[PDB]
RNA sequence: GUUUGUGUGUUUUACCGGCUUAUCUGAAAAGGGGCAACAGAGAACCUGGGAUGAUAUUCCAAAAAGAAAUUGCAUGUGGG
RNA sequence: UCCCAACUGCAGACCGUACUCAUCACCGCAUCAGGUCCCCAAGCAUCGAAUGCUCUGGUAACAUAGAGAAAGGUACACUCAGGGAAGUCGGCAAAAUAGAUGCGUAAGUUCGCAAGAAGCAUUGGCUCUGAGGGCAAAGUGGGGGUCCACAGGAGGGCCAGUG
RNA sequence: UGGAAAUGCGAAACACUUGCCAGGUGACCCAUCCAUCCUCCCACGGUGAGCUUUCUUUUCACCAUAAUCCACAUCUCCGGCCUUGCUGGGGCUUGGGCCUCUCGACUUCUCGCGUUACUCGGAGCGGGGGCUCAAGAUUGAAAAAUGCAGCUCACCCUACGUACUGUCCUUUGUUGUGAGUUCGGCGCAUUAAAGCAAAAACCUGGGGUG
């Protein structure tokens, strides 16, 4: 349900981030899926494993 | 991209103060100048290499350019093997 | 002076002696030779000229002309004089046509 | 500019848009508009009323 | 085919406002994009109009929020919309008419006294 | 080229459609689509539209006077008519 | 062919005129013919010269 | 067609989950009558419709 | 001192100009309700991509993808 | 008056998006020769989205198949001698019709047609020819090349040269 | 706020109102050929690939996007200092100015006609706007794109490098647009609205009340 806006704030304040920038779509595959560049000041994969994604 | 035309002119522009970044073209005859800059790339084109060089000089040390340049390799890849 | 001209680089091939043990003159013979004619039986032309040198084949002409005559000119001749062996021709520059070996 | 109109109901062939000043204090020019008993007899009119704030019910055809 | 040709819009159709027009890429290929809405528009005035302007400018209904007054600024009153003569015209009438207007007043005001 | 002996338009009928209707139709071809006079500009280039609507060409001026060839007799009388009576009516 | 007659004034303007109804109710019947006709009829003016 | 509203999503959504076997570690368990995924929708048989 | 030129004062006031509280004035009918166009009417992106497994005029960011276009809104400076 | 421009900084919702779109994804109950709107459309012959082969593309189609050369069939298969509708309710059938060109064309007719009326004639290949257009400078002479013109070039770059 | 004018401009600021704007501002059929753009084919050259054994010029390939300016020189004046000024395409529209066509004529056309003293035509000027271009510039070539090839650790990797080349031009045959309801059709006459420009308006700024 969520719109772009909404997320961005979200993420941002959550994760200590900006980001370049978003798109996003719902696949009825059910869920919207988030592409999110992550700027300069932050590396996707880096902060993966600070999530500690693999 | 929009092209500017006199060498003066040209100088405030590179001090635009946002004039982000400036590049060096060079193709036979001529090199063209071209500044990014908002909602263009403010581009002066330098045929000239003895003037070229002096104007090339005079480049503030604040200067961002790159020259035109050739195969970076894009830098794809696939990620097996 | 004005005209059209290229240089074949005819190396390899000639080096080896690959026109019955010589240095490119029975090439350079063979090669004036083919060239369409008529005025029945018997009859020649005289418009194109030749010169070899040491180790070039240059060929120039007043008139202008096709660079698609050369490149059937050598491929049926090769295959005409048994001569195909491991050579390929490429445009080296606009105006020398050069024959290659590889691997 | 500021007036009022003046196009409407097709009778002959003005050209358009024309000024015609009407009711009794209309002069007589054809389609000029007059009341019919103060229209003379005999005289030629076209799309006369008949309700009376109708506008040519008739003769209302070509 | 030999060539082609693709719809780079999913509307296909031809239609009146829809137009394309034909490109080689730098890619080289043949390729098509929209070709815009026509020159409606800046006609002149007078009688079902039907002629167009002069100076200031001729284009179309999306064009005009865009297109700027200083090229749209040759001018006399009521005829930023017109280029000479039916101006000249509906001056000369005025004018005129309204001499006599005020002539006839004064014809008739010599006869009261 | 050719330019048929008797019967101008209806050539596109051919035999179709009958002699006297041939006939009442010449009739209206002559009249409704031929040039006519222009009133104040005085040429004849008051030329049909639709349905009788005449416009000068080259005055511009658009006379409403309907059906096949604009203003009838009777409107002409007509309009001497009302010359006349009202003129009487002024005088 | 009348046009540029005219302004090379091998035509004269009456002349360019007639053969320009003239050309349009055609007895011109070819470009030979046409040129021809022109210097001939030029001839014809000559004549009237020096007959003058 | 080219488009189909939100609602229309939800219907092949919420059916596609459904069109696949029956959970398996469900029907291992004590008395499990459980004959099979009953319901599965198809397509080159059972199209939704409308 | 003059007269003039220049600059300044949170001067004072008169006067403008603005802007908002604020107060009075102040619109009429096939239109007093609102929908109805996945082609009418019809408002901003182009090409390129050692580019995906399967999507892209949407993916390619700062420099080599780039170059665009528009909106909104800021900001300073500029025109002022 | 400051926003009657400028530039610049800073941010962009929503909702669609795969793929199919048909001789299998649509729709014929059905993996159906039926149907089902839209864009695109080469080369060659030629009248030419024709017919035809073809490029480009795509098919390599698939549509159980093989094995087979008999009867019967079916086939958008033929052929038939002589003969020429006797046949037959009936010329159904099938067959005869042709392009073009030139030549030529009866009645009748509402004048318009009827008309490819009818009917003739011609039609390869080769090898020359003809006719049929566009595009320049009216137009010219004399004198100079025992150089007459300049900004352009080459070669003279082992001389103790110069830049 | 320029020029007799056609018609001008960084901004000549001026928004409500208009029984306001026959205001293509949306807006309109087909229709016609014709004209040409577009695209497109042919073919010349010319390149590059590929072909091609008794014979040949064979085959293919040979590119440029939106997005934006239009300042180069003529001429000014060829650059002393270049200063009037910035003059300067084609080829359809109209207009404007001068002259004023008449013994009639011109006149433009493929087309149906037309025009002219209701001002032709002719010249010169102003502008309209398909188009095309113009120093074509930007864009733009630059790993552009394309094709090669030479080498390369290595070349059977790799990274797919690295390096190199070449990568072009006249020229024939299709179609947007030419704006109308633009050729005919026409007892037929070819949606509408939101949607826009402009005007009129003209109240502000060029003012000391009292």
Redesign the pocket.
Known sequence: ????????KAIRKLYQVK??????????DGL?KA?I?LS?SYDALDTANKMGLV | ??????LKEFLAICS??????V?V??????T?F?V????????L?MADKKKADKIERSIHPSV?K??????????????S? | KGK?V?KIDCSIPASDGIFSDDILSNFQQYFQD???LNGRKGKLTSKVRVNMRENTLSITTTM???????????????????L?DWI???????????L???? | ?????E?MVAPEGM???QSMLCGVKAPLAIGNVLPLGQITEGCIVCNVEAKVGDRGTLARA? | ?????????????????????????????????????????????????????????????????????????????????????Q??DRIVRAFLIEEQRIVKRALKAHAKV | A?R?????????????????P??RAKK??VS??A?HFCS????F?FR??????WRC???SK?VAGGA?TLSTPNNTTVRSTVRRLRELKQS | ???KY??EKKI???????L??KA?GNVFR???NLMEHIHKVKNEKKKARQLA | ??????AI?KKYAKKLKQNRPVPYWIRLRTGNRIKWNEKRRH???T?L?Y
């Not at chain 2, 635009?16 to 970044?21: E, H, L, Q, S, V």
């Not at chain 5, 302007?53 to 200083?70: I, S």
């Not at chain 8, 067609?1 to 939100?6: V, Y």
């Open positions: 349900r969520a719109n772009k806006t909404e997320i961005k980001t370049v920038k978003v798109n996003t779509l719902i696949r009825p919207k592409y560049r300069a | 991209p929009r092209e500017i035309k006199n635009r103060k946002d004039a982000r970044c590049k073209k060079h193709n036979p005859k001529v063209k071209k990014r800059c908002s909602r263009h790339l403010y581009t084109v961002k790159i020259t035109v340049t050739s195969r970076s390799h894009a830098n794809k890849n696939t990620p093997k | 059209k290229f083919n060239v369409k202008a002309y096709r660079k698609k005559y050369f490149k059937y000119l050598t491929k049926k001749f090769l295959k005409k004089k048994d195909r390929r021709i490429l445009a080296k520059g606009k105006d020398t046509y050069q290659k070996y590889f691997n | 500019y500021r007036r009022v109109k196009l050209f358009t848009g070509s | 085919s030999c060539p082609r040709v693709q719809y780079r819009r999913r509307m296909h159709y031809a239609t009146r406002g829809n137009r394309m027009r034909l490109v080689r890429t730098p890619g080289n290929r043949l390729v098509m994009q929209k070709r815009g809405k026509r020159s409606q528009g800046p006609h002149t005035p007078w009688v079902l109009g039907h002629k167009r302007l002069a100076g200031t400018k001729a284009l179309r209904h999306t064009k005009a929020r865009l297109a700027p007054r200083h090229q749209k600024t040759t001018s006399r009153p009521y005829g930023g919309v017109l280029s000479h003569e101006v000249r | 050719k048929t002996v008797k019967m101008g338009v209806m050539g596109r009928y051919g035999a179709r459609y009958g002699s006297n041939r006939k209206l071809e409704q689509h040039k104040f500009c005085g040429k280039a049909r539209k639709a349905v009788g609507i060409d080259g005055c658009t096949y | 062919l009348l046009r005219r302004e004269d303007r009456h002349i360019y005129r007639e320009y109804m349009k070819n470009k030979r | 067609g080219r488009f189909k509203p939100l999503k397509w080159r048989r199209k419709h």
